[PDB]
Structures are given as C-alpha cells and as structure tokens.
Amino acid sequence: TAEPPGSPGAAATWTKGDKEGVGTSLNPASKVWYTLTEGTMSEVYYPHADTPNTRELQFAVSDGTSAQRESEQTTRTVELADPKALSYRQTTTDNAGRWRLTKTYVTDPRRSTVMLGVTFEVLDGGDYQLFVLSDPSLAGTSGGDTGSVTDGALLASDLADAATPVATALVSSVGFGAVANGYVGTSDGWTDLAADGRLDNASATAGPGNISQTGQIPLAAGGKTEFSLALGFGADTAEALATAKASLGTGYKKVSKSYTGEWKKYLNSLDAPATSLTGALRTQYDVSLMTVKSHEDKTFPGAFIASLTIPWGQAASAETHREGYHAVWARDMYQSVTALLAAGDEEAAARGVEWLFTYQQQPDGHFPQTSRVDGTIGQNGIQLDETAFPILLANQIGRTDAGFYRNELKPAADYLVAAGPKTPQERWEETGGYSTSTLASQIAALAAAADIAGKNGDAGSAAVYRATADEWQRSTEKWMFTTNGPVGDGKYYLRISATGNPNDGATRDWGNGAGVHPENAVLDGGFLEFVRLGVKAPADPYVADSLAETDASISQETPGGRMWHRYTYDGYGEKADGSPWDGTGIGRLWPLLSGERGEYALANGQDALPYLETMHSAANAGYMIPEQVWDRDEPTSYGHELGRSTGSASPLSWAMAQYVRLAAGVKAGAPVETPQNVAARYAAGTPLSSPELSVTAPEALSTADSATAVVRGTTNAAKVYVSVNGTATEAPVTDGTFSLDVALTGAKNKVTVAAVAADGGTAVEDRTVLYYGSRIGALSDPAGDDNGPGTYRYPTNSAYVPGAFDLTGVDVYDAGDDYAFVATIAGEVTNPWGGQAISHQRVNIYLGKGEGGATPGLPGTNINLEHAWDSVIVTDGRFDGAGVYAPDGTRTSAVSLLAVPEARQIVTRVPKAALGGLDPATARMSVAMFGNAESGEGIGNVRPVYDGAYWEAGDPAWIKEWRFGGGAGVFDGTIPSRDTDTDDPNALDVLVGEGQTQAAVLDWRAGSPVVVPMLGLQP
Ligand SMILES: [Ca+2]
Ligand SMILES: [Ca+2]
Ligand SMILES: [Ca+2]
Ligand SMILES: [Ca+2]
Ligand SMILES: [Ca+2]
Ligand SMILES: [Ca+2]
C-alpha cells in the first residue's frame, strides 16, 4: 500500500498542563473527557479517566494562497457557556479581522462522543476554505496510530494494547469537502496548508506511526456557516463510527441541552451553598464541584484520578505510556470525595470507599502510592497517609459493618500499627521520617479505627489502635516541634524529622535542586492538618507559634490574598528564567494551601471567605484552579503574573476540592470533614488520664524459647491487652500487675501492650520477639573475645567490621523438619562480597557424644576437638561452602543460612535428617569461629593467621590488610596451607566450659594443635 511521505512521523509531546476548561457528562454511559488549551481541544480521555488519546484539534483557514491556524491568532477567548454546566466556548478572530470562529464543547451523555458546535463567519468579501486539524495520540501514545476513511468519516485506531483498544471517528454534520491522512511533520494538514495554502495531500490512509487527519468543511453561501463535529470513541473503528453517527443523528442542540441539563440537575439536587458567596465565588463553587465529580471514572465508579492533565505537557514526550497526573492517588481521592461529601453527594463516597478497599488496597493492608482506575498498581512508594485517608473516609461514611471491618478496615489499621510512626514518604512524595502532615492522618485514622473496632466488639484491637494513636498524639511536639530553628523565635513545627529530635539540626537533600539543608530550616504548613483532623484543639499553642515562622518562611501576599509555598527551598516548579521544571527548578505558590489555611481559620471561628477569594483569584476564565501560580514581580520571557497560573497544571482535582470543602465549612461554621469522634477525643475540652504502664519482660528485642512468650509488668490501669501481629488477647490485671503467656505466630512478632484506664486514657509499649521454635538448649560466650589466644588482630581492611568474628552465643531450636542453629556475634552481620547471608564468617560446630580423645578439626582449621565428632555444621555463606560434613570432608547435607541483623544473628537451618540420629538435645559440641577464605588462600576455606611482627610489618600489603596476625608463620605459595607455620589455631574465638579459659585452651605455645572443649547445650 502506498503511503503519504513522512513515516514514521515526528517525535511528539503532550499538551500544556493548564487547561482552559474540562468536561464530561454526568452520565457514566459516555466514557469521554475533554480538555482545552491554547484555543484548541487538547487531550480527550477514553475509555478511562486515566487514558489520554488526543493532542490537538483545531481549525485552519486559508485564502487559497496562505493558510492560518487559530492557535496563532493573537485574539481568542475562552468562557464557560453555561454557569451550571461544564460546557466551554472558545472564540478565534483573525489578526486582520477577516473571519471569526466560535466553538462550543459538550459531550453526548448517552455515548462516547465529544461534540463541537461551530460557527464560522467570513467578514470579508469571502472566498475562504476551512479545515479541521485533528492530531490524535490514541491509547496514550503518539505513535502506533493508523488513520483511514469510510463513509465520509475520518477513522483512526491503535489496537496495540489488547486491554484498552482505542479507535475514533471524526464526523461533520455537513460532511467533508476534502480529506487527508498524513505523518506529523511532513504530510499532516498544517505542514501541507502552510506551504501553499492548499491541501495537496489526499491520502485515505497513514500509519502506523505519528499521524494526523484533516478535513475540509464545506461552507454555506453568505457570511457564515453553522455545523458541528462529532468525535466518537469505540473499541474499534466500526463502533467509533457508529457512535459518532448516532450523536449527529440526535444533533448538537439536543445533545447539548441534555448534557447541560444533567449537570444543572446534579448541582440543584445537592446542598445549597452559603448565601454569603458572591456571584463569582458561587460560580467558582459550581464549576469546582462539577470538576471534582468529573474526575470520577465511569467504568470503575468510586475511583477518582488526580487530574485530567499532564504537568508541563508540552515538554513531556508522548511515545511511551505515561502516568502524568491522570492516575489514582488515595490522597487526592480523599480530598475529592471529602469535598463531594461536603456538597451532599453521598453515593460517590460510598462507591469511593468500596472501590478503594476492593480494588486498590494491597493484600498486606496498605495502599499503593498510585494505581490505575482498575486498581493495577502504578507507583510503589509507601505513603502512610494514603492508607490512613481511606480509613478516615470509611469513618466519615459509616462503612463499619463487621465484614468490612475484619477483611478491609482491620488489615489497613494493623498496617499502620506495624509501620510505626515514621512514614517513608510524606504527601509531597519525596522524603521520610516523622511528618507532621502524615502523622496527623496516622493518629486520626487509628483513633477512628479504634472506635470502629470497639463498635464491632473487638476490644483488643480497639485498645491497640487507641493506645498507639494516643502515644503518637502526645509525641507530636517532642518529635517535630523545634525550639532552636534558624527562623524567628526558633519555636515552630518543622516539616519532617528523621530522628525525631527536632533540635538536632540533622540535614538531608530536599531534591529538585534544593540541596542540603537542616530539617530545622525547612518549614511546611502540613502541621495545620493537626487541627483539621481533630488531632489538636483549634487553638493548640504549638500549632499557633508555628504560624509566624511558617508565614515568614514560605508565604507571600499576592494581589488576590496571601498564598503559601509547600515548604522552604522547595524546587518543584519553573526555573528562574520562567522555563518549565525538568528535574530542578523553584517551587511556586500552591493555591490549595490558602484553602487549608482557611479551614484552620474557620476552625477558630474566623471569617474564611477571604481565603476563598484568594483561591479564586488564581483561577483562569474557565474557573480552573491551578496547582501553582507565579510568585515574582517580574514576568520572565514567558509572561508570568504574580498570583496567576504558572501554566504547568490546571485544574487540580485536589485544589478544586479544597475550594468546595472550605466553602461548605463556611456555611456550617466549622470544617465539615473533621472526624467528630477523633476531635471529641483530642480537640474537645477535658483531658484524659495517662495511666502508668511498665513492661518488665521481655526486653525491646528478644528471642523466644518456645511458641509462647511471657509478657508481664505493672500498670495502674483498669485493663491491659497484649496484641501480637494484629491478634490481641486480654491480660487480667491483678494488684497493678499482669502476666500473660502470649502465642507467637511468626518468625518476627511485633508485640503491642495497651493499658486502658477507667476513663479511657491509655499507655502503650512495643516489643519485638523472634521465633525459631522450641529451644533445645544454649551456649554462651563473652564479647571482646575475638582475638584467639588473646593476641590476634582482624585484617585491617574496612570490610572486617569490629566484632565480626566475635561469638556471643549459640542457641539451638527444634524448628519442625529442621534444627535451627542460631549463632550470635557482637559485631554487625554484614554481607558485602555478596554471599548467602554472610561473607566473612565461617563458624564450625562439631557434633559428637564425647567419645575418645583429641580429634583434628576440618583441614585449614589447625585445631583439635576434645573428643571425636560424627559431623560438623559449617556456616559459611561464601562459595557454597555451607552444610554438614563428615570427618572425611564429604558434605552429607545442604543447609540454609539466614541473616537477622537487627538481632546480630546468623541462622543455619539444618534438616533433622542431616544429623543421622544424633540428637542435639544430648550431643556434645565444639564451637569455633574462623574467617572464610578462597581455596587458594588456605586449605579448607579458612583465612590463615600469621606471625605478629610479620603481620604488623605490612609487607606485602595484603598480609596486614587481608589476613589475620598475632599468631605464627609467614606466607608460602607452594603448600596448600599458604602458612609456613600451622601450629597456631586459625580460630578467632571458640567456646569453653566452666573452669577453663579461651586464653589457655587456645595457647598453642603450651601444646599443638590446641584442643577445643566439647560441651553440651544447657536447657
Ligand atoms: Ca498511539
Ligand atoms: Ca498523531
Ligand atoms: Ca482489600
Ligand atoms: Ca566471644
Ligand atoms: Ca600460622
Ligand atoms: Ca570465646
């Protein structure tokens, strides 16, 4: 088949993020969302709010010699065509006033079609040609598109993805006079018309690649011509065509009325807004409300994408599937449904809560950073507020039925308890630690969950949740309120602390080119969330001293009112020259933050109307509230104004929601989404008692000796609950003491003890217990023993961390089908050389029954054992040298090694059968620690020990840097031992029994080879 020139078509980008307007029908039958920019129609989403398919659709007019695009006419306007519907009207006038184009957008509520009502007026003597320019980017990619023709329509498809196939059909109410398909940059309509003012291409096909279509619209005799276009979408070309035709069959006027009617009814059925809202503030309210509703998907009701846009889209390539802002974030959704809840749309919230827990929630209980409308995980960062908000949504809505609690809510709440107070990522999705913003949601979510659990008769989980929430609520100031900050009085909440000591002045890189700055120096308004979520009283003094420094550090006065930056030094925004963000830049003013300040003001009985005025001063002529507005007096080359959209991303469903929600709060006289049961506990009047709680056993970290562990202590509380990994059991309190043998249910058990006072006050205590099975017996050994007979030295290289070869203990456990031999060292369990669990350690455990006398150990060992042995367990993660061997070097069984750094342990799983009948419960054993080494470095994979002075001398360099010293002998490459003297043991330390010393037992000067004692495990 013959193709128009240009294949595969030019590289393409997306569209300006600042949309002049957006729209979709209220009816879910129409899976179409349109956006506008630069006087053209930009991305049109379908069939999900998360899939863009278009780049630009506009008109070109020619005089037969010269041709023009409306996107280049300096004079063009945008205005919403109906104060109660998302229908916009763009107007384009020739720079020489020869013609005028008027376009009004709407969509067919019954089917997937975007419709355009157009009026073309020739104000000259006449003789003009009009053409539609449609450059699609089907299925979220500018390439892989194929355009064709059929029955006077312009077809196009991209069925590369079997999951979401996309096809379109462009149809003229008066048909086309001439059509053409082409490759962008070579044979597309504008490239053609620009050249000679004539559409020379007539190809009825093009692609696959980056193509575009153009169709001449026949004009009517006289000054103007009225017509409409129908851009239909379907899974295939036939469907798309049929659908677009049906729309034209009904007609623009009819469809238009129907589209506008649905919205008018929706608004009119919802709660009437505050009467104190001026005309403009009311229209803003209405448009912001419809916009938030428009961010809800139609295929997956209850799912809300963040924004029908792509930030700095003109610089975002469109060749590969991109996420942009058109995806589902639990946080923004929270903002959206909470705003719809404020307006009266209960259904949307119920669907929302259902979708969140059914589709986005991960099996472990937490919510992914991002997801597709169908729940397919997108970004995988861990933001604790995204697991908290859905919980708070379920709390506000009453979704608390026993089933939803057990299988949905509880796993989410358990995750928060297990995750601890530090969040890996806060709401700006950049850094972790104690976040004021996120901890606020963590506390409120847990306190709500406690009431939800209590309602469902689960008193144990309720106490764990409340105790935890209470403990974090009373630590808010200790962890994030600095008293020595380099701003104002030095007293204020900082954005986030890594260690939880707001005065340590710890530093970190804050990304986007901001560089390193102490946490003490970064201010962030996220602390206002404390009163917003009922975690602190509206008049909380800590939150109050933060205002001054925070306002001085990141706020400023725009002509529309005071606005705030996200945080100090934030660089997520345009560059100094006004150029878009490309990894680095300088963050600007975020209008939604004015709304947040408004809720804080409102909560304190102040007039929040001005904040609404500020948010609206940031909107464009279409009432779209941007994510950011310029903050400088001067206008870079890119005309930028103080307090107006930078042009990067608008609307933001979140900012649109903040406007509606604050406005609803103004009518109520208080923020309406604040969790009442939470505020009743932390922001109300009387304080609760703080019971005393002391857990004497176990210690912070311990290893059980069975499947149960003793949890005991003292308390002056009425009740005490002990919960292990989500399963709680009550501990009867007697005379201010308690003691419960709780059941362990995993390798690692997170134990939480919650005490409850008669008035409801709580205290909490966390403990971690490692489980390996029933302890058979144990052996102990002192620390700082890692020096052989007391004169050996680790090889100088850094990899050999202190205490690496220092054994502190050996515990054996019956672990079902295996024996768990757990070795404990004073040093840190490291694994740099990439071995199995470990790299440097090679411990030997000779097992026997105490028969006979002196018996040599493994080869490169250079030691004898007290009595004979039937087998040895070699724990070496290097070179696959681990397993159980017979005295003849044969490996009789494979073993598994596991490193548990937190406990400085090294676990070796040995299948019971590996010990042919030899029961570790009554067996004698010798334990020695050696340094692993390659075969060519010493026989038996044992790093040898050389003479003291020789080693100290350092010559060659690798001797003192990669070998042990303080023993005897120098290197020798001729023999397998590589040591000219093997009389001295190669063990850095062993275990001995009562009456003996490692100094004497390892004293080769008194006898060689040395004889390591054979001892038994103590129950
Ligand atoms: Ca494509
Ligand atoms: Ca294209
Ligand atoms: Ca779930
Ligand atoms: Ca030791
Ligand atoms: Ca030696
Ligand atoms: Ca020792």
* Cα–Cα distance, 253 to 117 (Å, whole number): 8
Which of 743, 772, 801 is the C-terminal boundary of a domain? 772
Shortest-distance ligand to the CA of residue 57: 2
Does 976 count as an annotated binding residue? no
Contacts 24+ apart (CB under 8 A), 741-744: 741/708, 741/709, 741/710, 741/711, 742/708, 742/709, 742/711, 743/707, 743/708, 744/704, 744/707, 744/708, 744/709, 744/769, 744/771
917 shares its domain with 778:
yes
Number of structural domains (the chain) is 4
What's the gap between Cα 969 and its chain centre? 57
Longest dimension (CA), the chain: 121
* Cα–Cα distance, 76 to 496 (Å, whole number): 46
Ligand 2 centre to CA of 191 (Å) is 13
Does 985 count as an annotated binding residue? no
977 shares its domain with 894:
yes
- How is 483-539 classified by DSSP, letter by letter? SS-SSTTS-EE-SEESSS-TTS--EEE-STT--EEEGGG--BGGGGHHHHTTSS-TT
Ligand 2 centre to CA of 963 (Å) is 66
Taking alpha carbons only, the member of 88, 71, 90 closest to residue 80 is 88
Which CATH number does the domain housing residue 758 bear? 2.60.40.10
Say which of 426, 471, 519, 599 is annotated catalytic: 426
781 shares its domain with 762:
no
What is residue 609's three-state secondary structure? Answer: helix
Which residue has tokens 């384009």?
92
List CB-based neighbours of ion ligand 4 within 5 Å.
Answer: 781, 785, 806-807, 989
266 shares its domain with 170:
yes
239 catalytic? Reply is: no
* Total length of the chain: 1019
- Kindly tell me the sign of the dihedral angle through the C-alpha atoms of 855, 857, 861, 866: negative
Peptide bond into 698 cis (omega under 30): yes
421 shares its domain with 555:
yes
Taking alpha carbons only, the member of 425, 422, 473, 468 closest to residue 449 is 468
Alpha-carbon radius of gyration of the chain: 36
Ligand 2 centre to CA of 54 (Å) is 8
318 shares its domain with 198:
no
* Cα–Cα distance, 793 to 780 (Å, whole number): 22
Burial class (CB in 10 A: 0-12, 13-18, 19+), 360: buried
What is residue 716's three-state secondary structure? Answer: coil
Which CATH number does the domain housing residue 500 bear? 1.50.10.10
839 shares its domain with 739:
no
Helices (H) and strands (E) in the chain, counts: 21, 50
* Cα–Cα distance, 537 to 529 (Å, whole number): 11
397 shares its domain with 455:
yes
* Cα–Cα distance, 777 to 810 (Å, whole number): 9
- How is 882-950 classified by DSSP, letter by letter? -EEE-TTS-EEE--EEEEEGGGTEEEEEEEGGGSSS--TTT-EEEEEEEEB--GGGSTTSB--EEEHHH
Which of 686, 707, 734 is the C-terminal boundary of a domain? 686
The tally of CA atoms less than 13 A away on the side-chain side of residue 63 is: 12
CA dihedral 201, 203, 209, 210 (to 10 degrees): 40
Which of 254, 272, 290 is the C-terminal boundary of a domain? 272
Ligand 3 centre to CA of 725 (Å) is 18
The tally of CA atoms less than 13 A away on the side-chain side of residue 827 is: 20
Shortest-distance ligand to the CA of residue 788: 6
DSSP secondary structure code for residue 406 in this structure? I
503 shares its domain with 409:
yes
177 shares its domain with 81:
yes
DSSP secondary structure code for residue 357 in this structure? I
Given phi > 0 = left and psi -120 to 50 = alpha, else beta, which region is 647?
Answer: left
666 shares its domain with 678:
yes
699 catalytic? Reply is: no
Contacts 24+ apart (CB under 8 A), 1004-1007: 1004/789, 1004/967, 1004/968, 1005/789
Ligand 2 centre to CA of 625 (Å) is 29
Taking alpha carbons only, the member of 701, 696, 697 closest to residue 770 is 701
Domain range holding 731? 687-772
198 shares its domain with 52:
yes
Q: How far apart are the first and last CA of the chain?
A: 85
> Which experimental approach was used here?
X-ray
Does 733 count as an annotated binding residue? no
DSSP secondary structure code for residue 1011 in this structure? E
The count of other CB atoms within 10 Å of the CB of residue 126 is 12
Q: Are 160 and 73 a contacting pair, CB within 8 Å?
A: no
Which CATH number does the domain housing residue 879 bear? 2.60.40.1190
Taking alpha carbons only, the member of 884, 967, 975, 958 closest to residue 925 is 884
* Cα–Cα distance, 674 to 531 (Å, whole number): 8
